[PDB]
Amino acid sequence: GPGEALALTEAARLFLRQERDARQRLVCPAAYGEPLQAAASALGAAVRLHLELGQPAAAAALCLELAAALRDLGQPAAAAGHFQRAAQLQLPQLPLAALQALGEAASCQLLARDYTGALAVFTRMQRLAREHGSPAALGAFSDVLVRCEVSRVLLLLLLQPPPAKLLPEHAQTLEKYSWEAFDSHGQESSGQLPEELFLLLQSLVMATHEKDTEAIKSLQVEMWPLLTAEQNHLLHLVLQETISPSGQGV
């Protein structure tokens, strides 16, 4: 049982090393993925086996290994699907492991330019992190909330959902960075974010309300040291969609 599962992990990793040689170490133009097709079929039988053996955390490990492979091999959409299958198998028993897997799925959706899909995975994470990690969060879940907050605000400034798709959770998140009335300062921080990053996010959300593109350009260089490189890519897309809007055919 566990020995058959082990042997299938080694036999899958053989085809997957063979794929990495052709694709990544040789960069072969003729590398159509016959070993990758064999690796995905081998793990498909082995995930079926680990779930019949009733041990979801051992099936989720195969899904993480295949998801990481598909990302490295330049197929992020296929990786994001396998990361969400790992997360679903972990979530009833290991909430932090599931949040880590959903974080990699969100990175894969961003690589695949699937920004509305990335937005939905970050919202699922921020819910699960409050539900299992709590209003102050424990330190590990707090770092997840901090990622999800900054990523969701930049994704909402990129996508700008209509009232039909501005969910209660999106409206609730955005209003922290916004003004309710003509003499309101905007809200004070709950201590979730560093004060300097929070003031720069409020300034960014306010510069997009008042269409101040010189302020957005200034805030982009000022926020660069404070963001992860993924978040600097999101903030680049906000400044790019601000100056040259998509969907006009020009």
Partner: peptide
């Protein structure tokens, strides 16, 4: 001042001052 448009959350409109 500016105020939020009611038809779109991201749109703002002027009011006489």
């Amino acid at each position: 001042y500016l105020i939020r448009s009611s038809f779109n959350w991201f749109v703002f409109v002027e009011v006489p001052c």
